Amino acid sequence: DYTLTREIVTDPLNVFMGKLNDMVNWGRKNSIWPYNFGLSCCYVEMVTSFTAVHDVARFGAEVLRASPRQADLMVVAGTCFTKMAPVIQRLYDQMLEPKWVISMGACANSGGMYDIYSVVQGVDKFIPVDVYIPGCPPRPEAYMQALMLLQESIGKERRPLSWVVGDQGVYRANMQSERERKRGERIAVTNLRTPDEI
């Protein structure tokens, strides 16, 4: 159950090529360089994650490039305004493969609370998103959880090793949804602490 991009296909994978692909995916998922992109309040929570009290640096994702060429992760953390949607599209085009997209917050997910004339209702209207984060704003640890989700998504995708040989198509794994995976524990919740307590 994979997905081809240049189609629901199967697992394509010599046994040495599988180990080579696993090492490539391990190196790509353990070194993810986000693009410094200040849109709205969700970016404030993103840079709150980048600080000392949360330390996204532990995952190897602290480099925070100001140039789209060096970065390989686009965290759309803010509202997709109509004036900035071409800017976001151009910055995504300037990135180089492999690249991944995380929508952070309700604005980047669907437009959020701003169903208004000057706001594009979600960045997935024009940019293929890999991980969505609900929240307004999502807390910094929610951004780190989404980073880990992106890491385990990257760790089993199949990409070409070299551009001169082999299949050049990009295979993305169809992950099981987090909602269906966590339904076994979320439904079993019975009692929560009362709101009058600290």
């Binding site: 391990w26 070194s31 140039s67």
Partner: protein, 311 residues
């Protein structure tokens, strides 16, 4: 099999070992800069990829290697490929003269620190080529400003080192570290020491003296590894020129040299973490009005003391 060929092979293997260690130390000191900034900023830094983050550098290396190699369409391919090549090899060859131990030196040249000055000029060329070939106005302007900075501090890099050269009476590195057999040159050439430290920070484009936006993939990695190799080279050079190099009372010579070099690498990281960045005009005014006359007066007083003490 002859003893002369055995000695030739041993010296070649010694140079190969030195080269591999300085390149590996530059990459692992990029990683150590991340970890040390984490230490100085009340956090941990990368400590999840492997034990303590020791496999992080392999992860960025694999990410750099398996990225889309990209050259701009309206750019000069040769100069774009050439600029990281120069930024790597120039400061690597600058390290090629530093004696890390008695008997462990790549080339015992009679020019020495002059070869370091040649390599520094070629590093300035690397910055200029990177800025021009990107075909970008922002990168071109940033290269103009950065290259004028490096010129304003290479104007006195050598004149800061001339106090040590004057005391040693030679350009050779081993003669310089042998001239500090009793007192390290940081004591008499203190003003030369501070001016050389300032110039070494400035010509390495390090904080607080810091055109890379068009570079990506392995070229950006080559640029950064060359920058940290330049950090290693400047640290080892000031260890050999002002702190005796391999000489010390109790520890083996490599232990003393490595401890002093690692202390200056940590001082690089602490300078980056602590000081704010000054403005352009104040930086160049400090480079021209302050450091150059200080180096000239230091050389004059050094010569006067040397000739006075020659009975």
């Amino acid at each position: 099999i002859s003893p002369e060929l055995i000695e030739i092979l041993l010296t070649i293997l010694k140079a190969v070992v030195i080269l591999l260690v300085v390149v590996t130390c530059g990459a692992f000191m990029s990683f150590g800069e991340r970890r040390l900034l984490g230490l100085f900023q009340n956090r941990y830094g990368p400590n999840r990829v492997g034990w303590g983050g020791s496999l992080q550098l392999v992860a960025d290396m694999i990410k750099m290697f398996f990225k889309e190699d990209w050259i701009p369409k309206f750019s000069d391919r040769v100069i774009f490929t050439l600029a990281p090549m120069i930024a790597f090899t120039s400061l690597l060859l600058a390290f090629a003269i530093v004696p890390v131990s008695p008997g462990w030196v790549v080339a015992d040249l009679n020019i020495g620190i002059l070869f370091f000055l040649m390599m520094a000029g070629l590093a300035v060329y690397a910055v200029l080529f990177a800025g021009w070939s990107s075909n970008n106005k922002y990168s071109l302007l940033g290269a103009m400003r950065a290259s004028a900075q490096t010129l304003s501090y290479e104007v006195f890099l050598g004149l800061s080192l001339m106090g040590v050269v004057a005391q040693a009476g030679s350009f050779n590195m081993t003669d310089i570290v042998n001239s500090q057999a009793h007192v390290w040159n940081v004591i008499p050439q203190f003003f030369g020491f501070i001016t050389f430290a300032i110039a070494g920070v400035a010509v390495c484009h390090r904080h607080p003296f810091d055109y890379h936006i068009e570079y990506s993939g392995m070229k950006f990695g080559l640029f950064f590894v060359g920058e940290y190799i330049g950090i290693v080279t400047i640290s080892a050079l000031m260890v050999t020129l002002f702190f005796g190099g391999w000489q010390g009372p109790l520890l083996p010579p490599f232990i003393w040299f490595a401890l002093k070099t690692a202390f200056f690498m940590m001082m690089f990281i602490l300078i980056r973490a602590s000081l704010p960045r000054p403005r352009y005009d104040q930086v160049m005014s400090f480079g021209w009005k302050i450091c150059l006359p200080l180096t000239l007066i230091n050389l004059l007083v050094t010569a006067a003391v040397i000739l006075w003490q020659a009975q």
